[PDB]
Design a protein around this ligand. Sequence first.
Ligand SMILES: CC(=O)SCCNC(=O)CCNC(=O)[C@H](O)C(C)(C)COP(=O)(O)OP(=O)(O)OC[C@H]1O[C@@H](n2cnc3c(N)ncnc32)[C@H](O)[C@@H]1OP(=O)(O)O
Ligand SMILES: CC(=O)SCCNC(=O)CCNC(=O)[C@H](O)C(C)(C)COP(=O)(O)OP(=O)(O)OC[C@H]1O[C@@H](n2cnc3c(N)ncnc32)[C@H](O)[C@@H]1OP(=O)(O)O
Ligand SMILES: CC(=O)SCCNC(=O)CCNC(=O)[C@H](O)C(C)(C)COP(=O)(O)OP(=O)(O)OC[C@H]1O[C@@H](n2cnc3c(N)ncnc32)[C@H](O)[C@@H]1OP(=O)(O)O
Ligand SMILES: CC(=O)SCCNC(=O)CCNC(=O)[C@H](O)C(C)(C)COP(=O)(O)OP(=O)(O)OC[C@H]1O[C@@H](n2cnc3c(N)ncnc32)[C@H](O)[C@@H]1OP(=O)(O)O
Ligand SMILES: [Zn+2]
Ligand SMILES: [Zn+2]
Ligand SMILES: [Zn+2]
Ligand SMILES: [Zn+2]
Lengths: 309, 308, 308, 309
Amino acid sequence: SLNGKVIITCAVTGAIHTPSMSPYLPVSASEITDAAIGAAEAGAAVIHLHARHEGDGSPDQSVEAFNPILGVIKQASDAVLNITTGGAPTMSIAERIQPAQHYRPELASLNMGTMNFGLFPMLNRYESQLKHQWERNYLGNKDIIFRNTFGDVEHVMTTLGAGGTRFEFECYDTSHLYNLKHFYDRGLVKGPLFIQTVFGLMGGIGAHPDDVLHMKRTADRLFGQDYRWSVLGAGRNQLNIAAMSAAMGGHVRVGLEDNLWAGKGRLAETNAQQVRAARQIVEGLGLEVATPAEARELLALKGGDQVNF
Amino acid sequence: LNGKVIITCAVTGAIHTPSMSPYLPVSASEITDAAIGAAEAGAAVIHLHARHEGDGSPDQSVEAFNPILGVIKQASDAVLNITTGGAPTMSIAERIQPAQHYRPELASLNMGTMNFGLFPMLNRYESQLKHQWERNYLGNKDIIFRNTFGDVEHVMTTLGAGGTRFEFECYDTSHLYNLKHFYDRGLVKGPLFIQTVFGLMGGIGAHPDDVLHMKRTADRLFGQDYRWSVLGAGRNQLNIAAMSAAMGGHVRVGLEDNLWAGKGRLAETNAQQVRAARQIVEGLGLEVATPAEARELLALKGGDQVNF
Amino acid sequence: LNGKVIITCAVTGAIHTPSMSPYLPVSASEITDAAIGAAEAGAAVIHLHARHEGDGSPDQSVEAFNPILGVIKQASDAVLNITTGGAPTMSIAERIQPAQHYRPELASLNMGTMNFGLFPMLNRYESQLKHQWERNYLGNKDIIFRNTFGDVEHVMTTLGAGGTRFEFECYDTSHLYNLKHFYDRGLVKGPLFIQTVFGLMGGIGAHPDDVLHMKRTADRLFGQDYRWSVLGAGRNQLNIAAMSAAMGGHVRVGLEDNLWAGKGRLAETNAQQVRAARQIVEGLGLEVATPAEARELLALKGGDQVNF
Amino acid sequence: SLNGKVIITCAVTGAIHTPSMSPYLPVSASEITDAAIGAAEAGAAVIHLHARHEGDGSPDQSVEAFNPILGVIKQASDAVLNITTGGAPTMSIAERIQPAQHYRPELASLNMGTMNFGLFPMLNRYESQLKHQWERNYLGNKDIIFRNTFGDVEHVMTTLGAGGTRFEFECYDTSHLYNLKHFYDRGLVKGPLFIQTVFGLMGGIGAHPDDVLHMKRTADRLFGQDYRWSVLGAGRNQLNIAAMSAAMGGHVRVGLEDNLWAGKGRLAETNAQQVRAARQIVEGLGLEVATPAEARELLALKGGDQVNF
Ligand SMILES: CC(=O)SCCNC(=O)CCNC(=O)[C@H](O)C(C)(C)COP(=O)(O)OP(=O)(O)OC[C@H]1O[C@@H](n2cnc3c(N)ncnc32)[C@H](O)[C@@H]1OP(=O)(O)O
Ligand SMILES: CC(=O)SCCNC(=O)CCNC(=O)[C@H](O)C(C)(C)COP(=O)(O)OP(=O)(O)OC[C@H]1O[C@@H](n2cnc3c(N)ncnc32)[C@H](O)[C@@H]1OP(=O)(O)O
Ligand SMILES: CC(=O)SCCNC(=O)CCNC(=O)[C@H](O)C(C)(C)COP(=O)(O)OP(=O)(O)OC[C@H]1O[C@@H](n2cnc3c(N)ncnc32)[C@H](O)[C@@H]1OP(=O)(O)O
Ligand SMILES: CC(=O)SCCNC(=O)CCNC(=O)[C@H](O)C(C)(C)COP(=O)(O)OP(=O)(O)OC[C@H]1O[C@@H](n2cnc3c(N)ncnc32)[C@H](O)[C@@H]1OP(=O)(O)O
Ligand SMILES: [Zn+2]
Ligand SMILES: [Zn+2]
Ligand SMILES: [Zn+2]
Ligand SMILES: [Zn+2]
């Protein structure tokens, strides 16, 4: 019965885009919860969550920052809440791990390799618009290392896994799939693996169709039937890559964390706006958007009532 | 024109038979109704076969298109694309006669000789076949769709003289290489309307790797001098259409290629499949090409410079 | 057997003609000398055609192999692989007669109907063609190598009854899918000796992406139940052989497939191409398969259980 | 005339393998120079060089460590000398850059992205054989980050480029090709680009034929005709991947830096042994091994007489 069900994840704000880039980027806790609830009611079964300082909008990966967010969304929606362990790519593991460790979510992101994270491409378009000094230092930083060593990843699996949390394994290139294979063969994570292949980041693999098929092909060969595929296309590749995945039996992620645009010369005003576009592609293919309960079964999650919020 | 997707609708064809679906257009008026509805739903190109109204069998004669082409033209400015293949069991200088006489903007052109397999189609439909010609057709394990190098060279010369440009039908890698041979000799000038056909028994399959392989090969052989369209047979129709739309290509739908809408549900109109492809195209943030935009992308002569 | 590479040598074939090279074996004794030298250089399988000694044209009769098979068998324990294709312009129940009568361990089996293009070969050789049949053959733009689904099913049944296993000749993706159809019906049992042929006009090209595409497709359709061999036409012979050897596959060489040794240099013997492939195989740290190791990898009946 | 010429690089010792793994790993300066000269006389046009402490064989990336190596090889051979800027993957950029900066070689390696570097797979086979404590700490370290940020890479290009040195761009995955494309489009390096795609490392892309074709395909699309392709296959993939490259118009790297084995149950005794095997594949294909002078033309190098040793 779960055949032909597509899971839409909506990543509502993230840590990469900054407030000066768009007035529609959710910053406050109430903006983030409204964006999440609106996206779930449009058909997002999973909400991927970051938090921000309400003062200047900078990334906030503290336990307290999620307190006015998680419980509010849960009361209003049964969507699966996916808490970031990535935060801002400049953060340490000790900092990034605390929210998921405390709240024991059904799902948490797990980044699978250390990589350069380049943001200066966003300086070409946005430098003159930046209003906060932290935005200038952040996007100008040519030395960002998004740290996820083999020791880090093993520690996160062990720590968060004890609380029943399952992972969205974020894979930005082929090597991250091989890294995941290493832990999968050691039995440190069990199937079905929720593998998200991320396309178009500076420091990661590109967004060419060859890149998509290569990651899909590699995942197929390394993990067979024991994984569920999701994709993330950055910027204007968002909907193109979501459609490829939906057409190939995979799942999709949209959201203002990854793309600020709704069309040509047009910024996206809400996260739900992007969920509806993906949903239109899903239903045009003759498929159906998965409910949260259907996502929990496809991904083997512990249930929205087994969390600490 | 950068974000415009041409939807071609093939309304009846010659592979499916009337016993397979009551919605398959057969009579001339059913074909014209199907074509006009598909155009109004957003199909810029209509791909056309004719059939004998008696038993529904393929009819590739000149007169068969007479009550079809003019009727559609009067009601729509869609590009009319006349088959030169017909049923895969037919000859050449005769197969090109409809397009030769009517001088359409577009004609299909199959790029290689291949086996055509339909006897698995017999597995499910054998019970409900009404006409004897359907049983012989589908049970035939010796169908050869003939398109020799000499045949293809003849079509390009003969039909090119009428101002007709071609939709190059490519069912496997060899057909792209066959097209590269003629392209290099200058027998066809760009932009090439290359249609890669997936899922037929006797052709390449419909796996996503098959799609990317044909795309990569076309990119390497023809660069920027071609326009890519896809045809996904049967249940692969919309999946492969979505891949193409997402990769900068164009899409073909229609009851010639797929009789099914969902699970155990037959498609009732061609327009219904056009609407689905259109929903995908627009969900992607793209727009469906008008007939006028298709004519520019494909370098066609105009819907008023034909012989009908 | 894990690091053993089967070298097949195709000593003369039916595509090249005698005016193209004085080293192309024609007479029966030239073919047997070529086969024995290739086996002694390390070729475990010898792939065989016969020719008329009068003008060098293909000869696919039963008697044509009589002074060939027994001579080779007496001098070598190589696996003898008899063509069922002959010249691409030939019929079926007759084409299978040599293999039907002699009941070899191996027979070739072409898996699809395709165009065969040789008129570009005419570009360079037209000046030096001695026999009229060479000019008509190479200039023919209408060659159709016929292998319908019904034809192939007939060969599998008829020749399978003699204990003969097949080398499935696959010239494009569709031929692997065609083979998958018969494999699923149980008409051929593994391990399948699948030979992917690259570089022919009418088939897939010889680009590295073409090689990987055929390999990927075969892996997905047949898994571990097949043995992969490659044939790179002309100048691609050793490049594609090296890719296969490096990827766990097997290699085919021979003057049937390539007349050239280097730049403007004709290959003088089949053994010479076998030695080259062997140098590559051993440079990789692998070993060339003996005939006895080939028989185990391919599940053959034995060189003494034949009718010659 | 340079058509059909294959460049063989021989990497004689490296920094990854350790002395306890094989008694044939060159350690002393005289062992390294003998290995280099023997490999060049077998047909290696380029020698890729690391140095080691003669005491315990640990990696030595000091300027002084190359002093008894470079001049000795140059006097005995006209091979192109390729000095590592990678050193041991635990080293900083300030340390790793000094040899190439001082000696101004024709060629230096340039690693194109930050990555995990996993060596514990080598602990499964070798742990009981290790004789030095530094070997145990090194191979057991699950937290190795091979640092090559965008800022680092730009700095190395600028610094070493002023001395006429050209680069072997070491690419361990698709993202490193995209990283190189970024600098190539900014004009910070000029063609022909010597791009080496590295296969089989833990933390990098694997050694499956699909991985090889993917990297080749991506390089083709991003750089067209303006690059020269070399490959490195780790361990027992060394000769397989060298053959694929040679068959596809690329160049090859062998050496005990990457593979300790000559066959089944047989350690390789010399670097030249591996050069001869690759040469046998090259000549079996009907191609020819490039001379040093031919390598200098294919790679646009400044000449062996324009170095500071
Ligand atoms: C650790 C973690 O949490 S990792 C999370 C993963 N997310 C990320 O890292 C962020 C991903 N996204 C990004 O990095 C940024 O959005 C970027 C850098 C890709 C944005 O790049 P930009 O060049 O500014 O934007 P992009 O090219 O994607 O889209 C804007 C352009 O596309 C156009 N566009 C957008 N949608 C459409 C459409 N549907 N049709 C036509 N044009 C469109 C816009 O009009 C604009 O055109 P312009 O360049 O002429 O003005
Ligand atoms: C030279 C020339 O003339 S070329 C013309 C180009 N076109 C052609 O040649 C014809 C192309 N089409 C065909 O050949 C035929 O449609 C075929 C052979 C592909 C049909 O194959 P079949 O096996 O009969 O059907 P197929 O499996 O593709 O689709 C029907 C099945 O899929 C299911 N299905 C199809 N779409 C959906 C959907 N969106 N959701 C759920 N189920 C679906 C149906 O319910 C049915 O289920 P079943 O397999 O359990 O019966
Ligand atoms: C069903 C059946 O019967 S199937 C049997 C399977 N085999 C076949 O069908 C036949 C396969 N072979 C052929 O068709 C022919 O050999 C052909 C058509 C490929 C030959 O093509 P041609 O264009 O004549 O030759 P090709 O370019 O491949 O090789 C000769 C050229 O390459 C050069 N060349 C070949 N190898 C080398 C080398 N190692 N080094 C340098 N140059 C070389 C030659 O010097 C010559 O140079 P040129 O192109 O400037 O003249
Ligand atoms: C920063 C820089 O400088 S980066 C430089 C790049 N270099 C590197 O990073 C190092 C690359 N290499 C390595 O990492 C290591 O050599 C490793 C981890 C790959 C070695 O892995 P291992 O499993 O120990 O060895 P590997 O599997 O490659 O080869 C050994 C096995 O292959 C077998 N083998 C080797 N060659 C052959 C052959 N030709 N035929 C058959 N078997 C063979 C051996 O007999 C052995 O078999 P066994 O496992 O049954 O004992
Ligand atoms: Zn995130
Ligand atoms: Zn048609
Ligand atoms: Zn043959
Ligand atoms: Zn090195």
